[PDB]
Amino acid sequence: PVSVDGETLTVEAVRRVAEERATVDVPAESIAKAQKSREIFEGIAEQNIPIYGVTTGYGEMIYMQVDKSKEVELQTNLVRSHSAGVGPLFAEDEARAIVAARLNTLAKGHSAVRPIILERLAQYLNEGITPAIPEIGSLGDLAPLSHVASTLIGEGYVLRDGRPVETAQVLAERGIEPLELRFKEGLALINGTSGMTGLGSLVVGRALEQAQQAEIVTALLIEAVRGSTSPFLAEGHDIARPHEGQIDTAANMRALMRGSGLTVEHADLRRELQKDKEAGKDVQRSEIYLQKAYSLRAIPQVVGAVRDTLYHARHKLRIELNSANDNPLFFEGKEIFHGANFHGQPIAFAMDFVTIALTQLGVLAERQINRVLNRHLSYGLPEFLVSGDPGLHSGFAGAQYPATALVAENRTIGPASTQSVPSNGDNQDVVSMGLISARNARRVLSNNNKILAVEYLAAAQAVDISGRFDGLSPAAKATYEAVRRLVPTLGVDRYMADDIELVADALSRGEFLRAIARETDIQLR
Amino acid sequence: PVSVDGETLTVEAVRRVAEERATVDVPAESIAKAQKSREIFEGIAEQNIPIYGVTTGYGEMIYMQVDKSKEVELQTNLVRSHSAGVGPLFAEDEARAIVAARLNTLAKGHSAVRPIILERLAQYLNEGITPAIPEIGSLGDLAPLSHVASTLIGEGYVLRDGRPVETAQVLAERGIEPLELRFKEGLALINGTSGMTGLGSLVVGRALEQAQQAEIVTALLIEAVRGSTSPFLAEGHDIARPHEGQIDTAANMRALMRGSGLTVEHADLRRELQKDKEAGKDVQRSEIYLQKAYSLRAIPQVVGAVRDTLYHARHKLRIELNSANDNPLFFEGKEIFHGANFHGQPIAFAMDFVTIALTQLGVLAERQINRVLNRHLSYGLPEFLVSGDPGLHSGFAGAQYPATALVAENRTIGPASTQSVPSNGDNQDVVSMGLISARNARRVLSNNNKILAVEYLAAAQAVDISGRFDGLSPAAKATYEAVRRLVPTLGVDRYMADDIELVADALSRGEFLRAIARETDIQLR
Amino acid sequence: PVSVDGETLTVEAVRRVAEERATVDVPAESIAKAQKSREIFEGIAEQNIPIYGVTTGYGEMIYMQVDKSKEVELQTNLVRSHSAGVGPLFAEDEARAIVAARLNTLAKGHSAVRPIILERLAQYLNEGITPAIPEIGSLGDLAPLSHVASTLIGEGYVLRDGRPVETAQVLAERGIEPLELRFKEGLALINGTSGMTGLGSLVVGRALEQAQQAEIVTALLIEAVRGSTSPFLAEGHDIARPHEGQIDTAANMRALMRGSGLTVEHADLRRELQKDKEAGKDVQRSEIYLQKAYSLRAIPQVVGAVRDTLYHARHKLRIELNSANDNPLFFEGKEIFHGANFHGQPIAFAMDFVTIALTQLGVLAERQINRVLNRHLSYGLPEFLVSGDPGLHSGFAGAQYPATALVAENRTIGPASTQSVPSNGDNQDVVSMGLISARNARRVLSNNNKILAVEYLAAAQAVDISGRFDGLSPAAKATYEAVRRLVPTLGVDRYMADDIELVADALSRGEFLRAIARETDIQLR
Ligand SMILES: *O[C@H](C(=O)O)[C@@H](O)c1ccc(F)cc1
């Protein structure tokens, strides 16, 4: 069971809860801290003193003073009037991540919510009650979270088979009585970054796995075209250019290609080249390349930079998950804190950066595909990997286009964290648009799986056409077999879409990262 | 019935076929021209002479010479190997538009396809057989069109209830025998801009209707806040700044607000202001605004610029629809033309421009919403249009956010027509990415309907709160009633998402443009 | 003196050398290590062994083997043939930063360059000989660096009074005999990321000062409008939301406003509002805002996020500065390393992230200007800060425009790190475009100084119009005085451009940061 204590939750744990449906538990210690905060807070609210969103109107209308006799109505009107999300609904796993993020925030203890709220959110996750959350509305996450809050009071909708179903009916069925929103509970539930933080957690965790699966297919490809191992030597990174991500990619590449009979060492290349040179010629041509193109040599640098970005984002998300992103906040023995911890700028920035890094990861993958399909670059392989008669057959020629087109499409996705537009009578004059940033990243992530899908298919085909399977390392043979388990070698031309979608789906669920886990003793970073 | 002659097809007709399921007919004259082209062409191919994609490999592999004995296989292998589209499938109406565009292209007579191909495409449209076309793959439209071509030879998939169904089964059922691809027919079916041109036609036609529905709600709003009519006077446009689009918007605005008892003439404003001024004061304050903010005065200029862009795009699309966007091409008494009329640059540019214009249309609408919800700008209306007790109730405060957020999101959509990436061994070193451009435009179009939805709801609410219904013009009363038919006045706060989605859907099907048609004698440009 | 040892150079140290003309010194240990590497390397090159760029052609032409007898010409043709930079020339400080970065790289000892190369570079820096480097041409930094290398062999141009003068006469004009490039020296001088890393260091270092100067005027503004101190309370950050940047900004804000008689504590605002509410009624209006708008409240969250991005970039840059970003590389007892440490992806990403972070910093600054100029938003200030009769005078109304316009302009700047385009026969099939990223960030940084200048002038004017000078904290008074030393109070309308440029220049110089350090006991993070 995952412990939601608002203190030690990790991105990986969030994914277990969201994707693996792992059980959630709010420890007794967190419940005690919440109960104490609530009790003291109630005493303050009971005195009818000014507290944002508790005894005042919302946003710009904070100038309106509301009596404590309107407690439940104030909180209820907020949730209803703000459930104005539009567009597609988040998938079940995305919605679960968002709920889990909100639960952890409140579990931290500074939101002054009744323990029952924590218990109910925990119950929805544990019993599989998934809110229907529209993806659009947050300025960075009122709208999305208001739809979640609605399901707690028996309103709004819950997701069932990808379809929204009236919450009232679902609760009546599952035998659950809706809650009533007391002081600050409506606001606490919707005043945070849980939308972008929950979705961002899924994206970043998956992005790291995508970085690994890119390294996996890259290694197979390098072996297929017999590239040099020189670029991955530890000295060039650990010593010469110690960027953390760069060090990790190189280490993974070395581990992945360990045991290969196809890769060539620099010592062997220069020797083969020295013999091919004759001695009375000052300048002479050679068909031997002492070094390969950037797409097969600058992998540690590029994928490493992507990793560095992903590491930074995961770090920010971990901090955010275990933060009290709510307002106002309760701190014992202190005035009620009135700030802006609901502002998602830190995460909006983080996700816009992930979008950029992942776009480049796809740019690299796409150029690697170009490399093996172009006879002028493939190094001995037939044009477009045609096994039979080229021309009559196009092989993988048409399969390159969707990959190329996706690189262009990802490049049309611009940063959202800088696109703030003032609203609410200028009260919200600077916002983060962080959920848009997170959805942009999810999109590139999804597009990259299609790009990698074509690369995995091209790599396996290259192995088949060159008859180099027996020369592959243990990891490469495993990668090759994983692909071939889904899609057969390309003999004569054939409809490609189903083949590409099948491998794309495998990538999305981390099947190749699994193959290596299961088939080799390799532990990827 | 719509006449598909490759000569006079209009964007409106395309939409009738796609959306209204209007019958298609290829006139006898077009059939005769096709039959003649095919017969002469066959005689040429029969001689086994070099003809791109007929007796040669494809793209970069044009260096491969293929004997006429491989006729059917060559064309078949192309269609199969290039059916590599990925992502979501186009909706039924979008797919129909694409098919219709391809049919019109071939109907022009320079593609040298057998009349049967025209007849079959026409049959699929007339019998409701809709190809399952993945949205991603085109570099600008091989992949998408290859999936369409597949359905003609009993391969690929057809769309049924939003689900892809094996074409073979559908044809066996409907009692139809798949065709065989003869010389050049596989290539002719997929070598064009029909994907971006077909989808672009739907978008542009709808965009013009969106421009009209923006003018409709703008007029209602202007009447509700009693704005000045001065900005719309014909002299300021027809004479002073004759941009075509600007002239049309002003004319529509004048027609829409004709008969209003709420709008004020400049003569009345200056007089009311002159009386409010006293005479011994050189500088004095007044609560009277002789002119209103840009969002209620610069409508002809902004919406007019949007119209100009839409007019240009529709013109380009009309030309493209009735062009032979295929290669190579047959011209009697001439060598076979080997060019690049498959290159979608003209349309890629057009659609990127539509994306930009529509984004601004939404920017304007969103600021008009801000105008009526902000008590400092609304001109007498209650804050956020709250009918009861503000603070306790937020009214439309939360509904503004999805509109604001969509403006930011549309701004994250960048031009695709400039993002060419070389592929196919550098043979396709400069592409247009036009289908991405068209899908970008469709997205902004769709987002704008949600923005306008909030504006229509805010406008009607403003009419209710100010009690100005009886002062509304005939068109305004009609617009108001149209909205109220779907959604009730906002008394106490309530869940808003369903209300917003309902009006957004009405906008997408042109319900407000219809209300004016049906209820007034106004004929909008 | 600044020690360029390839191990401990900092971003600050780079700026001292570049901006303050600080003397550079390559430690004897570095020279010794270089010497050692050079001796061993020379022994290998003498064997006519295959080494990239030493005994082979460059880039794609690596298939060409070049005999050691062509030692000097090979290196020379390279530098000449690649000196193809275009566009404007870098400023003297920028050029110096680039040279310093390259020198530090070679000082690491793995480039196998003769010590004289290190010495001559250090001499150029110490003697004020600045290379004329055009800004465009790097794919991420061959062209920029080739222009630098040219000056070492008496070719290309040197920068004098902003104009390029032939290096030949400049060297003669000061008794320096040009050098002759030997094995690997030409390549080592131009094969790295020193262009983007040198410029990036300057930008990031100045960006941190900009964040501080943003916090400085923001604090002044908050005091001028009597804002609440609640948002900056440590507990809200150090405890509730532990983001490093957020914690730093909050700490800085508390220190900047310490001792203010104008700011209000939450407790006082709360009591003040309590006193204003009547009993009985459960909903009543008030003119008191318990909380201020976001632009005055989520400073820690927004600027903190900017800071986190800047800290990450500085970290990347420090690592890069002290790395062997060159190829091939020498490691004693190992084969010559043939990798891609010249690939600027880590820096390209970092600078693209800085561009985004700084854009939002300006967004916030501009909305703060809007707050103070708008009578409906500013607390106790006349419209547009007009001292006399408004209407007759516009005050700062016209000055808001350039700030607003710059936010829009910065938003048109897109990421460059993802815009790779393949070149050099596809050898450079995946590049970083990092120098473009670095120049993008520089542009936003520069634009922000103008936006901020308007904010500084507006803040000072607000102090004068409200007569709140005596209530200002020590830091606020110092800021006010610094502004007033440059520009006087705005009485009647006047030409504004010179005043704005004056304050903008002061900002670029870090004058306001210096005012706080020279007049107060504050130490800003
Ligand atoms: O990135 C190249 C390398 O060192 O591998 C660089 O030296 C280079 C210089 C000049 C060229 F024309 C191509 C590459």
mmCIF file with all atom_site columns, C-alpha atoms in Angstrom, chain B residues 322-452:
data_model
loop_
_atom_site.group_PDB
_atom_site.id
_atom_site.type_symbol
_atom_site.label_atom_id
_atom_site.label_alt_id
_atom_site.label_comp_id
_atom_site.label_asym_id
_atom_site.label_entity_id
_atom_site.label_seq_id
_atom_site.pdbx_PDB_ins_code
_atom_site.Cartn_x
_atom_site.Cartn_y
_atom_site.Cartn_z
_atom_site.occupancy
_atom_site.B_iso_or_equiv
_atom_site.pdbx_formal_charge
_atom_site.auth_seq_id
_atom_site.auth_comp_id
_atom_site.auth_asym_id
_atom_site.auth_atom_id
_atom_site.pdbx_PDB_model_num
ATOM 1   C CA . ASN B 1 322 ? -10.554 21.787 -59.003 1.00 0.00 ? 322 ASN B CA 1
ATOM 2   C CA . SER B 1 323 ? -6.914  21.153 -59.768 1.00 0.00 ? 323 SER B CA 1
ATOM 3   C CA . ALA B 1 324 ? -5.094  18.032 -60.889 1.00 0.00 ? 324 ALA B CA 1
ATOM 4   C CA . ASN B 1 325 ? -3.072  17.604 -57.713 1.00 0.00 ? 325 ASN B CA 1
ATOM 5   C CA . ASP B 1 326 ? -1.487  14.377 -58.840 1.00 0.00 ? 326 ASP B CA 1
ATOM 6   C CA . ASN B 1 327 ? 1.662   13.225 -60.659 1.00 0.00 ? 327 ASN B CA 1
ATOM 7   C CA . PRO B 1 328 ? 2.562   12.421 -63.271 1.00 0.00 ? 328 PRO B CA 1
ATOM 8   C CA . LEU B 1 329 ? -0.176  13.997 -65.422 1.00 0.00 ? 329 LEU B CA 1
ATOM 9   C CA . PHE B 1 330 ? -1.626  13.300 -68.854 1.00 0.00 ? 330 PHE B CA 1
ATOM 10  C CA . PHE B 1 331 ? -2.220  16.034 -71.422 1.00 0.00 ? 331 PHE B CA 1
ATOM 11  C CA . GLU B 1 332 ? -3.269  14.856 -74.880 1.00 0.00 ? 332 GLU B CA 1
ATOM 12  C CA . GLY B 1 333 ? -0.652  15.360 -77.572 1.00 0.00 ? 333 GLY B CA 1
ATOM 13  C CA . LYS B 1 334 ? 2.067   15.991 -75.001 1.00 0.00 ? 334 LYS B CA 1
ATOM 14  C CA . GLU B 1 335 ? 4.780   14.163 -73.092 1.00 0.00 ? 335 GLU B CA 1
ATOM 15  C CA . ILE B 1 336 ? 3.648   12.898 -69.700 1.00 0.00 ? 336 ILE B CA 1
ATOM 16  C CA . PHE B 1 337 ? 4.024   15.797 -67.246 1.00 0.00 ? 337 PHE B CA 1
ATOM 17  C CA . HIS B 1 338 ? 6.420   15.043 -64.390 1.00 0.00 ? 338 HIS B CA 1
ATOM 18  C CA . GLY B 1 339 ? 6.133   17.774 -61.774 1.00 0.00 ? 339 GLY B CA 1
ATOM 19  C CA . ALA B 1 340 ? 5.027   18.297 -58.190 1.00 0.00 ? 340 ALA B CA 1
ATOM 20  C CA . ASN B 1 341 ? 1.331   19.201 -58.172 1.00 0.00 ? 341 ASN B CA 1
ATOM 21  C CA . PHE B 1 342 ? 0.994   16.917 -55.160 1.00 0.00 ? 342 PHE B CA 1
ATOM 22  C CA . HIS B 1 343 ? 2.867   19.537 -53.111 1.00 0.00 ? 343 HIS B CA 1
ATOM 23  C CA . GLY B 1 344 ? 0.455   21.113 -50.651 1.00 0.00 ? 344 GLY B CA 1
ATOM 24  C CA . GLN B 1 345 ? 2.361   24.334 -49.933 1.00 0.00 ? 345 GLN B CA 1
ATOM 25  C CA . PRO B 1 346 ? -0.446  26.594 -51.204 1.00 0.00 ? 346 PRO B CA 1
ATOM 26  C CA . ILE B 1 347 ? -2.910  24.979 -48.805 1.00 0.00 ? 347 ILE B CA 1
ATOM 27  C CA . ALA B 1 348 ? -0.447  24.449 -45.953 1.00 0.00 ? 348 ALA B CA 1
ATOM 28  C CA . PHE B 1 349 ? 0.129   28.223 -45.968 1.00 0.00 ? 349 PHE B CA 1
ATOM 29  C CA . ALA B 1 350 ? -3.592  28.954 -46.255 1.00 0.00 ? 350 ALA B CA 1
ATOM 30  C CA . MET B 1 351 ? -4.481  26.803 -43.238 1.00 0.00 ? 351 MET B CA 1
ATOM 31  C CA . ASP B 1 352 ? -1.633  28.102 -41.043 1.00 0.00 ? 352 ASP B CA 1
ATOM 32  C CA . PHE B 1 353 ? -3.075  31.560 -41.756 1.00 0.00 ? 353 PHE B CA 1
ATOM 33  C CA . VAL B 1 354 ? -6.579  30.417 -40.769 1.00 0.00 ? 354 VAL B CA 1
ATOM 34  C CA . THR B 1 355 ? -5.143  29.114 -37.479 1.00 0.00 ? 355 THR B CA 1
ATOM 35  C CA . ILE B 1 356 ? -3.676  32.562 -36.768 1.00 0.00 ? 356 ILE B CA 1
ATOM 36  C CA . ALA B 1 357 ? -6.816  34.487 -37.720 1.00 0.00 ? 357 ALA B CA 1
ATOM 37  C CA . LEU B 1 358 ? -9.147  32.243 -35.714 1.00 0.00 ? 358 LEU B CA 1
ATOM 38  C CA . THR B 1 359 ? -6.874  32.513 -32.687 1.00 0.00 ? 359 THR B CA 1
ATOM 39  C CA . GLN B 1 360 ? -7.372  36.294 -32.750 1.00 0.00 ? 360 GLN B CA 1
ATOM 40  C CA . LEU B 1 361 ? -11.137 35.842 -33.206 1.00 0.00 ? 361 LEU B CA 1
ATOM 41  C CA . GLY B 1 362 ? -11.077 33.937 -29.917 1.00 0.00 ? 362 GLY B CA 1
ATOM 42  C CA . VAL B 1 363 ? -8.824  36.522 -28.276 1.00 0.00 ? 363 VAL B CA 1
ATOM 43  C CA . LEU B 1 364 ? -11.459 39.162 -29.061 1.00 0.00 ? 364 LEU B CA 1
ATOM 44  C CA . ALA B 1 365 ? -14.368 37.036 -27.836 1.00 0.00 ? 365 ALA B CA 1
ATOM 45  C CA . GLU B 1 366 ? -12.554 36.250 -24.594 1.00 0.00 ? 366 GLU B CA 1
ATOM 46  C CA . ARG B 1 367 ? -11.870 39.932 -23.880 1.00 0.00 ? 367 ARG B CA 1
ATOM 47  C CA . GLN B 1 368 ? -15.542 40.715 -24.530 1.00 0.00 ? 368 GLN B CA 1
ATOM 48  C CA . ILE B 1 369 ? -16.436 38.157 -21.852 1.00 0.00 ? 369 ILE B CA 1
ATOM 49  C CA . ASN B 1 370 ? -13.975 39.858 -19.481 1.00 0.00 ? 370 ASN B CA 1
ATOM 50  C CA . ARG B 1 371 ? -15.703 43.150 -20.264 1.00 0.00 ? 371 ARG B CA 1
ATOM 51  C CA . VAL B 1 372 ? -19.153 42.095 -19.050 1.00 0.00 ? 372 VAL B CA 1
ATOM 52  C CA . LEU B 1 373 ? -17.983 40.183 -15.971 1.00 0.00 ? 373 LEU B CA 1
ATOM 53  C CA . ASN B 1 374 ? -15.757 42.985 -14.664 1.00 0.00 ? 374 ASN B CA 1
ATOM 54  C CA . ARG B 1 375 ? -17.890 45.522 -12.781 1.00 0.00 ? 375 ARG B CA 1
ATOM 55  C CA . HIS B 1 376 ? -15.258 48.174 -13.535 1.00 0.00 ? 376 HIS B CA 1
ATOM 56  C CA . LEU B 1 377 ? -15.877 47.672 -17.253 1.00 0.00 ? 377 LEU B CA 1
ATOM 57  C CA . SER B 1 378 ? -19.420 46.266 -17.588 1.00 0.00 ? 378 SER B CA 1
ATOM 58  C CA . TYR B 1 379 ? -21.073 49.702 -17.376 1.00 0.00 ? 379 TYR B CA 1
ATOM 59  C CA . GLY B 1 380 ? -23.580 49.219 -14.553 1.00 0.00 ? 380 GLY B CA 1
ATOM 60  C CA . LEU B 1 381 ? -23.835 45.414 -14.471 1.00 0.00 ? 381 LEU B CA 1
ATOM 61  C CA . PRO B 1 382 ? -23.262 43.488 -11.201 1.00 0.00 ? 382 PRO B CA 1
ATOM 62  C CA . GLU B 1 383 ? -19.874 41.867 -10.664 1.00 0.00 ? 383 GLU B CA 1
ATOM 63  C CA . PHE B 1 384 ? -19.501 38.640 -12.642 1.00 0.00 ? 384 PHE B CA 1
ATOM 64  C CA . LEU B 1 385 ? -23.192 38.865 -13.490 1.00 0.00 ? 385 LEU B CA 1
ATOM 65  C CA . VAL B 1 386 ? -24.263 37.610 -10.059 1.00 0.00 ? 386 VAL B CA 1
ATOM 66  C CA . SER B 1 387 ? -28.042 37.962 -9.777  1.00 0.00 ? 387 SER B CA 1
ATOM 67  C CA . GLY B 1 388 ? -28.186 37.321 -6.043  1.00 0.00 ? 388 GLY B CA 1
ATOM 68  C CA . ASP B 1 389 ? -25.649 38.004 -3.287  1.00 0.00 ? 389 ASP B CA 1
ATOM 69  C CA . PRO B 1 390 ? -22.103 38.259 -4.678  1.00 0.00 ? 390 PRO B CA 1
ATOM 70  C CA . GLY B 1 391 ? -19.338 36.555 -2.715  1.00 0.00 ? 391 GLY B CA 1
ATOM 71  C CA . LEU B 1 392 ? -21.798 33.960 -1.444  1.00 0.00 ? 392 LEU B CA 1
ATOM 72  C CA . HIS B 1 393 ? -22.413 33.405 -5.147  1.00 0.00 ? 393 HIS B CA 1
ATOM 73  C CA . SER B 1 394 ? -19.719 33.718 -7.835  1.00 0.00 ? 394 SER B CA 1
ATOM 74  C CA . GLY B 1 395 ? -22.063 33.679 -10.821 1.00 0.00 ? 395 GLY B CA 1
ATOM 75  C CA . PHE B 1 396 ? -20.024 33.471 -14.025 1.00 0.00 ? 396 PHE B CA 1
ATOM 76  C CA . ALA B 1 397 ? -16.648 33.954 -12.308 1.00 0.00 ? 397 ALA B CA 1
ATOM 77  C CA . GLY B 1 398 ? -15.604 30.325 -12.746 1.00 0.00 ? 398 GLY B CA 1
ATOM 78  C CA . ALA B 1 399 ? -16.995 30.147 -16.293 1.00 0.00 ? 399 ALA B CA 1
ATOM 79  C CA . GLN B 1 400 ? -14.522 32.747 -17.529 1.00 0.00 ? 400 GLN B CA 1
ATOM 80  C CA . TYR B 1 401 ? -11.521 30.508 -16.845 1.00 0.00 ? 401 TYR B CA 1
ATOM 81  C CA . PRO B 1 402 ? -12.104 27.894 -19.573 1.00 0.00 ? 402 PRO B CA 1
ATOM 82  C CA . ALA B 1 403 ? -12.415 30.727 -22.098 1.00 0.00 ? 403 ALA B CA 1
ATOM 83  C CA . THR B 1 404 ? -9.231  32.425 -20.855 1.00 0.00 ? 404 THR B CA 1
ATOM 84  C CA . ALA B 1 405 ? -7.373  29.098 -20.788 1.00 0.00 ? 405 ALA B CA 1
ATOM 85  C CA . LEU B 1 406 ? -8.360  28.322 -24.396 1.00 0.00 ? 406 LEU B CA 1
ATOM 86  C CA . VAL B 1 407 ? -6.906  31.606 -25.651 1.00 0.00 ? 407 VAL B CA 1
ATOM 87  C CA . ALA B 1 408 ? -3.593  30.581 -24.063 1.00 0.00 ? 408 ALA B CA 1
ATOM 88  C CA . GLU B 1 409 ? -3.858  27.080 -25.532 1.00 0.00 ? 409 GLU B CA 1
ATOM 89  C CA . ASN B 1 410 ? -4.547  28.332 -29.066 1.00 0.00 ? 410 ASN B CA 1
ATOM 90  C CA . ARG B 1 411 ? -1.490  30.549 -28.680 1.00 0.00 ? 411 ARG B CA 1
ATOM 91  C CA . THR B 1 412 ? 0.652   27.429 -28.118 1.00 0.00 ? 412 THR B CA 1
ATOM 92  C CA . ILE B 1 413 ? -0.229  26.236 -31.636 1.00 0.00 ? 413 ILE B CA 1
ATOM 93  C CA . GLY B 1 414 ? 2.552   27.146 -34.040 1.00 0.00 ? 414 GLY B CA 1
ATOM 94  C CA . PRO B 1 415 ? 2.703   27.187 -37.872 1.00 0.00 ? 415 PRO B CA 1
ATOM 95  C CA . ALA B 1 416 ? 3.296   23.796 -39.494 1.00 0.00 ? 416 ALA B CA 1
ATOM 96  C CA . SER B 1 417 ? 3.798   24.859 -43.135 1.00 0.00 ? 417 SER B CA 1
ATOM 97  C CA . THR B 1 418 ? 7.376   25.868 -42.323 1.00 0.00 ? 418 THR B CA 1
ATOM 98  C CA . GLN B 1 419 ? 8.372   22.686 -40.469 1.00 0.00 ? 419 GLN B CA 1
ATOM 99  C CA . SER B 1 420 ? 9.474   20.538 -43.409 1.00 0.00 ? 420 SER B CA 1
ATOM 100 C CA . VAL B 1 421 ? 11.863  17.705 -42.513 1.00 0.00 ? 421 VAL B CA 1
ATOM 101 C CA . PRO B 1 422 ? 13.686  15.876 -45.353 1.00 0.00 ? 422 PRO B CA 1
ATOM 102 C CA . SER B 1 423 ? 12.943  12.180 -45.873 1.00 0.00 ? 423 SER B CA 1
ATOM 103 C CA . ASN B 1 424 ? 12.973  9.357  -48.418 1.00 0.00 ? 424 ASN B CA 1
ATOM 104 C CA . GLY B 1 425 ? 16.720  9.491  -49.027 1.00 0.00 ? 425 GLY B CA 1
ATOM 105 C CA . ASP B 1 426 ? 16.406  13.252 -49.509 1.00 0.00 ? 426 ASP B CA 1
ATOM 106 C CA . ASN B 1 427 ? 14.013  12.853 -52.459 1.00 0.00 ? 427 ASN B CA 1
ATOM 107 C CA . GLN B 1 428 ? 11.341  14.646 -50.434 1.00 0.00 ? 428 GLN B CA 1
ATOM 108 C CA . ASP B 1 429 ? 13.696  17.327 -49.154 1.00 0.00 ? 429 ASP B CA 1
ATOM 109 C CA . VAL B 1 430 ? 11.012  20.035 -49.020 1.00 0.00 ? 430 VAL B CA 1
ATOM 110 C CA . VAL B 1 431 ? 7.457   19.211 -47.892 1.00 0.00 ? 431 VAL B CA 1
ATOM 111 C CA . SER B 1 432 ? 4.493   21.293 -46.674 1.00 0.00 ? 432 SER B CA 1
ATOM 112 C CA . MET B 1 433 ? 3.052   19.487 -43.608 1.00 0.00 ? 433 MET B CA 1
ATOM 113 C CA . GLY B 1 434 ? -0.274  20.915 -44.812 1.00 0.00 ? 434 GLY B CA 1
ATOM 114 C CA . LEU B 1 435 ? -2.518  18.353 -43.114 1.00 0.00 ? 435 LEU B CA 1
ATOM 115 C CA . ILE B 1 436 ? -0.966  19.290 -39.770 1.00 0.00 ? 436 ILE B CA 1
ATOM 116 C CA . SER B 1 437 ? -1.732  22.930 -40.655 1.00 0.00 ? 437 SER B CA 1
ATOM 117 C CA . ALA B 1 438 ? -5.353  21.946 -41.376 1.00 0.00 ? 438 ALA B CA 1
ATOM 118 C CA . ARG B 1 439 ? -5.661  19.996 -38.118 1.00 0.00 ? 439 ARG B CA 1
ATOM 119 C CA . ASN B 1 440 ? -4.215  22.960 -36.201 1.00 0.00 ? 440 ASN B CA 1
ATOM 120 C CA . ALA B 1 441 ? -6.928  25.180 -37.696 1.00 0.00 ? 441 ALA B CA 1
ATOM 121 C CA . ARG B 1 442 ? -9.642  22.649 -36.845 1.00 0.00 ? 442 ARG B CA 1
ATOM 122 C CA . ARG B 1 443 ? -8.419  22.673 -33.245 1.00 0.00 ? 443 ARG B CA 1
ATOM 123 C CA . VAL B 1 444 ? -8.609  26.467 -32.847 1.00 0.00 ? 444 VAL B CA 1
ATOM 124 C CA . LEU B 1 445 ? -11.994 26.387 -34.575 1.00 0.00 ? 445 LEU B CA 1
ATOM 125 C CA . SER B 1 446 ? -13.197 23.818 -32.031 1.00 0.00 ? 446 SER B CA 1
ATOM 126 C CA . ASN B 1 447 ? -11.720 25.719 -29.069 1.00 0.00 ? 447 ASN B CA 1
ATOM 127 C CA . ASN B 1 448 ? -13.352 28.965 -30.252 1.00 0.00 ? 448 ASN B CA 1
ATOM 128 C CA . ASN B 1 449 ? -16.795 27.355 -30.052 1.00 0.00 ? 449 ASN B CA 1
ATOM 129 C CA . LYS B 1 450 ? -16.207 26.802 -26.314 1.00 0.00 ? 450 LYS B CA 1
ATOM 130 C CA . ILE B 1 451 ? -15.064 30.417 -25.928 1.00 0.00 ? 451 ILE B CA 1
ATOM 131 C CA . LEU B 1 452 ? -18.090 31.713 -27.808 1.00 0.00 ? 452 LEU B CA 1
#
